[model samples]
Target chain A: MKFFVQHPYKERIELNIGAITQIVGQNNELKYYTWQILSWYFGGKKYSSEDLSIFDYEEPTILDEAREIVKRSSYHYIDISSFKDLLEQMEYKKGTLAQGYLRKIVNQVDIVGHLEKINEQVELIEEAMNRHINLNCGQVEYHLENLPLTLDQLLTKNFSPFFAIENKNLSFEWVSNIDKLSLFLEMLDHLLSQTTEKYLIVLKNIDGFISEESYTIFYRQICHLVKKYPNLTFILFPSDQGYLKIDEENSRFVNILSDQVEHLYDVEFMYERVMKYYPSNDFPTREGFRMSLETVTPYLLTKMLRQPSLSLVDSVILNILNQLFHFSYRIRCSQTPDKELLQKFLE
Target chain B: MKFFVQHPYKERIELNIGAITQIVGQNNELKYYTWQILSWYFGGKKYSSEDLSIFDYEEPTILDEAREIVKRSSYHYIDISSFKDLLEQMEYKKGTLAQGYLRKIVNQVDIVGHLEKINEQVELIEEAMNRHINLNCGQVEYHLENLPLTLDQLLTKNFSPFFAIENKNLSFEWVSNIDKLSLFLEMLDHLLSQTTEKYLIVLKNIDGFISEESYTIFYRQICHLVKKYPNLTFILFPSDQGYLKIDEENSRFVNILSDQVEHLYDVEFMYERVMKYYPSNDFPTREGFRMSLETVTPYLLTKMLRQPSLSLVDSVILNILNQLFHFSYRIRCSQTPDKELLQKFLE
Candidate 1:
């Protein structure tokens, strides 16, 4: 059970899994608050029970009708105003500076796939920390920039929300050389899995540095993993190549760098996986993704689950149907089929 | 003849051929303004002996002092502010509703490229025109909508810019697919030839409507013509084939779309030709071009020209050079050497 949803805002809400399980299992809380808490677990919100008195409180009434509406639209039906107010009052207790910094870094770094820009962003993040954090910021920054010295250092490091630096020059060294491809992929996997806070994982130089041979190998491996773990939403930044949307698959990849050429596998897979979790009946066009790219921000992703568009959802469903046809073809011609399957096996 | 001197602005000056030739030929006027008028056609602003001072009548300075600087520079040294200003004024005037609406339509329809936001721009131009022109804006708007037809009528009647369309829809019938292509290329040629007026050319649905074979043939012919006519800077848009640049020598006849499976030919020849005439000494990088494709407006191009960097130029040059070398090798090995030249038959 999801104890608390990550806010996607720089200041994230850590999941109190134990506390949530206890609260849900027990039924001692106020009825309306209990229902609201349950709703929150389902990625909804809690509203005040002021209107409950207006309803008969017996069977089908105005409050029941409203509750039904909220239940149906779980993603958006959240009353976070009270919660927001509580958090605002306790402003002194905030997200760790590192968490906030990482969130900002990720927001900026995700869009950039160039080595120079990635380095610049890292430097900027370090500078920001130095400015805000009173103590240990300089030491932490130094460690972040120097972890690339050894593999042992990377593995043994205390990787966490506020203190983590697996590899400083990993983006540069790993991208430039082919031998370190596995290590680079491992780093990305680790980053994703270990991200406790709202974190950023920038796969810099992924498109430009990865050789055709390496790309095929890496793409196939990632697809296999994704097939097993369909819950993952991996956003790619394809810096090079031309034309973003090429195939008939529903998968979408935004070419922030402008030359729309993203690898076929990433775009197709993204469309396929996203379709599984997202309700097709609600939003249709996948306009949220497009909007996200246009806005140049990650906040849109969290915001999308609340207020979805019918057109965008429709587009997403159509893409999935398109991918299904494509997948059916691949299954029939199973000639030890290669990387194309990874892309063709759209959600 | 060079009409303009080292002034802050102006390049080409039109001349009324008769009287000025006699005045300069007789050695009556010795200064650059007089000599320039005699050698080259200089227009606008007439100066007489009665108004001239000793400073204006002094002997012209030679290039002996600046020879080193001139020789070291790979680009032309010209103060084209005046010309740029004139073009800016023309654009401004043309942007007005009474003048610019039709001009924008003609430009959009006749120009050989598809720009993302052109539809909105066209609408904006139309709205701008409504304010200035007393004529029926709706009717004018309707005519603009059917510009392709009007263009055909003009072509059929051998009517130039001065001719106005009587029937919009009927005129469209005369425009053949090839004629349309030619007209689009011509518009691009005209736009590029005007050194002071920077513009964009967009061609849409090339691969979809035009067969691959025909597309290659069309491009080949255009490339040949472009090479022949140095006045027109032809930057052929990179097709899906992964190869961005193409020239006459390595012209591929089949499957023009970018494919990772196949090696592309002559991607650099065209890059060099286009970059050569660019005002800046620096060239465009693959990365730079990729970036420019996003929100591709005139501002992006202007910025690129203004801030020229060495590494970016190298990337473009290197890509083209690689293609040139590959093409040259293919040609030499595929065909026998010129035996006549080897034998010195002509000598």
Candidate 2:
């Protein structure tokens, strides 16, 4: 599920591996796919190993707005009791909000600076959310109940240097609604635009909240904003579920004016991918595995970053093969294969 | 602004002349462009002339939800003072709603019939709205004032064979809102599905009501519905002002499961188009004219259905050329010009 088999150059260029491009494909993976892309950028690694880096830019500031893969995911209930974990990332240093405010004026006033403090607040907010809490019922309940209020006061009530929008009493709860989606993206774009340094932001999962209409609007709004600032770039991973399928296979939509439009996919051929574990393969599952994996588009593979839990990832891939072709494999290695273990689909 | 030049196969194809595809480009043409496409589909004629038919199929029933090229065009205020003419199309005989209701159940009841009555009511209601009126202070005023009420009682009352939704007394004024857009599309899809005959729906101008976010949502919502039934096709002309540019020139988005994925452009080359008007060409303005026309993307040409008032269309084209290159040309045709009758950009 994680490793990729390299496809040809046409597929590579069309894939537009890493730039201001929208990635479209069937997303059967459990949300881990887009995050793996950020892993490639963050770690300067290939498929999270030494395989090959899918992105051209490495270790730029990463904005992980996409959903988590393994987390319990009613996460997206659209039902909101809290915004603390979410709004915390939104707490900008006074300067960031000033620039965000500055962005507003230029679109209407312009003279700018003081961006680092604001960046820190957003980073801290997201960082604070990522910190794990005690799993006990009382602790989890206590935190969930209070964090939203904490986040509310955290921004407007002035507990941190990051606080800026205190005067307006802006509710972060508004962030959870899809109707406010356009404003949400606009805010992020302005905040991100303050810097000259490279930034790669990954966006996904809110296409989860509603219908294709929301995805279309989100795709358009974000894609528009990304092109407006040269300092910014984004990895848009909208599930191909309800959006237009531009191609029969892996295809992309480009920015109206981006220096890099088409990003190449860092994918290997299915035959090549199969050979890594089998190395001089036998017949029990070669054709079945090859054919099943071929049906899984290269764009799907490109999103994966090879993980440490190899067997678990391997299980998903094999299960997908079983799901599509409707047959579980029992690969027998040469010479009266051991019943205890056998080769099936794997990286 | 409404004449077309056949630009050959590649442009034709990438243009996807007609089908369930999304048309993206600058929409400076007062929303006339998408409607002209309907004129082509409605009359079994070419560009409303003997010229050439741009659409593969012609003279089927036309559902023109797009904005009118002329007439009063604050048309898209999104403010709902009336839904009379709008809801009248929505009124149906008992059977149409039954089929629509049936369509709901299948997706939820199957067993279908009585589509003709519903079709008649929609046709009758639209027909009644189109009848011209005296431009009197009171007579014109009187009808506009009463037609909405006439339409209200027109649909839910026992005024005609069309009256059906009496019990629900469903308020269609709600239909004017974009938030109800998805339900609007769903209802139309179900209603349209009742007939086995083909339907060519032209949708535009709602993108006019709001920002790019609305355009994105509208484009996506409609594009999805178009692909659901094979009997249906749509011409989606969303303004390219805020959307992604798939190509530097005219590019398109395809329906996820459309058979006619790539439609061709029925456009002629600038040189070819120019020579038609200037046989045995000479230059007081050949290069200037040619260069300016070339800058106008072919997709823009494809949407045009040649109009009767050729000179007015010519004026817009020339104005656009002037707008872009910042030059007004003075063509001296042979005898240093006839002053007013000199050559310039035209049909």
Candidate 3:
């Protein structure tokens, strides 16, 4: 379905056009029927431009054309539920990897420091495997794989599973199991090494899942590594999602870590999570919105069918994911991207 | 030999106070008599509050004390000739780097860019040394050390030797063995690399040397480099620096270089050179006039023989040298045993 409208700048003409389109197709346009009956609320009369000398040359031709287009094109609306079903089908067509949303999460932050952290973590996994002479892929995968699942499985699963996934035919779990403590220490050492350099790690701390205690542990480990390698700088973002609770305890953790590490900075969650989130939703589908089983399928289907191409549909969905991940990356990397670009995506 | 004065807002007040000291000791009390007269001319009475606000109550006290010291110690009148003599002595003492009176043949237009060009030349020498490539050091140093000599030799033999002798360590003798064309190419390459970084290269039309043809050559070279390295960005100063000369022949050279290089951004000349070069004296002795050579010489001599440990002569000399070199490492690194540590020497 398609609709078009142009509106004069003086009034909320576009909104009126939309409303008119919404109502026109469903009902007969009986011109004689009273559209509005009011004595004072609609009392204002239209004045000729002849009386207004300054605007005498200005005609409402553009507005007139916009109104006419709206009246002519009235088949733009479809059942929202039916539209969403199509989006779900499209998601299955594109596998998880090409699923724009997934790549957005992975490449969200591309700063140098963030890359250094990842390198450090990878090095630690390598080291732990070496220490126990546990070169066996199966054994390494067993220890490094995401074993300690928490009650907050959904939040932790996204990141923890990454460690267990085999990279170059070796899983982090197998690497970490050389000797449990030593392997854990090795991983910790890796995480610490990652902390050595200032990174712009963007996090979407929407629910404060990255709690004060968790951040303390993260920072302390990072700080120890920073001391070990003074040249490393770490820029951490505890919550790219939203403002995290940082009362006395959280602040103390920050203070302790700050003292130990020379290079560390934090951006509160308010900038992106609260102020610059998704703003527009006129295209028949929204992706960032949370959904239960009831809303997910229909909404997903609607998006896939409405967008111009699979790529366009993918871009829009990926954009939201990018916002979440890139923001997390920024915090992690301690770097900020151009605001105008981010704002462009928001629109 | 010793004198001290206190002032609030030391940073701003110190320069003016020192200037006053220089004028007082050199020109004697007759050249500038009253505090009001000196302050009016130096700070400007129209912007009295803005200018003098940097000085606190203690400023007047110091000025009065310095004036009294100059009057009591030196009764002789000092004209420009005496001022010149004082500077020569100071230079011999390793108290000056011969920077102040050094003539700069600047263009008429681009002062900022020209300064940057000189600074960039300095950097080229520094960077080449650090990089330690076969062609880098010798070629970079050749241009820097030889250019002034070539210019001086073009002017007069007496001055030619001065360029080679005065700054021999920084002179082009090192690259004399290399083929001139090859050395020029290497230097040009180094310049191209340095200039390509955004805002790093400020170009100007030097009034007398660079011509249109030379500019075109530069432009062509830069364009070729840019095409080769698509990711690199650079800017060029105006072809005017390349055009500046006494005759039409040089003007053609500007076109030659500009035609060759696409990255050239032309700039003005007088704003670049003439004004910066002409104002300061061949040797500036104003600072030492009022203190070391004028009032404190007798005092220093007495202290040197009998009460050296208690004298402030060493601090005074160091302070004077510091200003002469603008605290540059070139001179600082060349300090000899006579002035290494004045206090310890005196003790």
Candidate 4:
């Protein structure tokens, strides 16, 4: 499942050799295969000195032995899906929280669409509850105990329940009502923690569902829950108008959230994935392929391949290609391309 | 009075020229002198071309005309002390806050030492007040109405006054008492604001007088006062142990205080002042004089000149000379000497 090879530096070479010897001595095929792949990528043909040169200055017998040990190891293709299933099975055997959470999410996927959107649905229920002041515990508790049903029912009812009580003249204390709502959220968090699953929960266009005040409250509650349940992850993509405003208001929470979050661009990975599925014959050389990779993102590349009407010299393509060429020229001259150079290329 | 010259870059050259022209047009000798000094420092020889070259790429006719106008303007040596007296007299006419604050500080210098240590003294009074709970308003108010007396009398009485009433069994509310103390501080601030004098209040070894908590309270109060009276200036030298600790505790207050304070090393200025008074005959040439200036600080130079016992190759002198040589070498080669180099020299 791992694509990258981990190489040991000069300091850790002896330690790596000892560890590799133990793993290889056990006749562990998977470990041997991983070692072989790492050796092939990092070691090159000379086996001992060639690869050692990449990491160390002086060649030692220990480094040579380490390289030889890895060189003799076997190689095999690892299926990512099967590896994930095996990992899940192992977690299930251990009876971990992650396994339970995964199972719950998989079971509820049909009803809830995805576990990630549950917080959005919870906000919806809260909004609905705000409209009604006379909803007794009998109704509220019944609905909360069945969360997905409550969310669906509230949505179907347009947030207005037809159920009437004799206390129409009586007013409900909103502050006290928040106590019940908070308790419900706490119970929900408890359930989430019991389920043993790591999640990448992406909340797209967060501003579309909540105001700045509500976002703060949601983030505060989520931050508490996230700390308690380390397995749960939340990604928030703020609407264009709300991004800076939300950041200014809740920078501390944002900073805490960012610590747990792994920031990445999907385009590069997507490009590799797309190329794996739909190989391109246009690029003959590695340089041409790399040039195309730099010039076009995976999405654009996929769109161009799928549709013939898209011109090769489309403005976006031309602009990207111009910068790519300029960047390549700078690299050839062993100079770092400045922003001004890139701007000139675009012009 | 003015020591530093303000040089303009190309973008700001026109604006600088316009302002300089207007000041010179009014026959302002000080402004013309300042402009001339700035030109001489920045513009190396060739008059029109040299001065224009300091500001721009190409020599312009306007720059030539500006140079001619400055050349015709008279020059004179300005006495800093006399200039300060004149400035004070002018502020007295205008009735500015800076003048009043300066006058108050000057008038109180004999008794208070300096206005800067007033906060430290105030904290000491607070600490003394904390020990005795029964000191009535008659004693407290009489002293507070006259502040320097409050501080002096508190010291003289050893914070114990025998004004026995029936309230020997009764206790004063500490919280309400603090309110009165705060009110006194507010009144003190009111008096400071009413003063028309600018201040350069330097607090020496502040950590000697207050704990971290008291420091925060003092700084918070001072920060508020500083904002209210923009004419007031404060310089704080925290005790060695407390400097970094105090910075960590109140970075916001530190940042605010730093805005109003100009941090500087008195070593260079002190060297100039000391050399002016006790001119060294050892260094004949400009290079030798500048070399000595680099190697020896004002304090060290004064000590070395005053005491024949201190050897030329003493560890402190040697270390300083090593750095001074390295720094001069870098400057000669047109390379900027980094902080690391200076730190190494210090070590």
Q: How displaced is residue A219 in candidate 4, in Å?
A: 60
Summarize candidate 4's per-residue lDDT along B243-273 as a digit string, tens digits. Answer: 2222221222221111011111223442344
Against the hidden reference, what TM-scores do the models get?
Answer: 0.23, 0.24, 0.14, 0.15
The residue ranges of model 2 lying beyond 4 angstroms of the native Cα positions read A1-69, A72-234, A237-347, B1-24, B27-235, B238-347
Number of the top lDDT candidate? 2
**Residue A280, model 2, lDDT:** 26
Q: Which lDDT tens digits does candidate 2 get at residues A184-289?
A: 4566666655655555455544333334445556666755765676555555444322332232123323211111122222223333444443322232254444
Model 4 whole-model lDDT (C-alpha atoms) = 0.31
Best by TM-score: 2
Mark the 10 consecutive residues where model 2 chain A has the least summed lDDT. A338-347
- Put down candidate 2 lDDT per residue, B1-347, tens digits, no spaces: 11121211212112333334444432222223234333433423333212222232232222222322222221111111112323433445443333344434534212122334545566677567656644458545433332223323433564432221333222333122454455546666676666555555555433323333454575567656655666665555443223322221233332111112122222234334433433222322444443333223222322222211112222234334222323333111111122121111000
After superposition, which runs of candidate 1 have C-alpha atoms over 4 Å from their true positions?
Answer: A1-187, A195-210, A224-230, A234-347, B1-188, B196-225, B231-347
Chain B TM-score for the candidates in order = 0.24, 0.36, 0.18, 0.24
DockQ value for model 1: 0.01
Candidate 4 structure quality by residue, lDDT tens digits, A1-347: 01223333313212221100111111112222233333344333244433344335333232243244332222211111111222332233333322333345446647556444776776677768655644557545322322444433333343321211243221111112223224434544756656555432333322322233454465577567766765554434332121222211122122111101111123344334434433222322333333333222211211121121111222223233223323211011111123232223222
Error of 4 at B156 (Å): 19
Q: Report how far residue A24 has shifted in candidate 3, in Å.
A: 43
What digit string (tens of lDDT, one per residue) describes model 1 on residues A10-81?
A: 222212221001111011112122222333433322332322221222111111212322233322121222
Q: How do the residues A19-47 of candidate 3 rate in per-residue lDDT, one tens digit apiece?
A: 10111111111111112111111223244
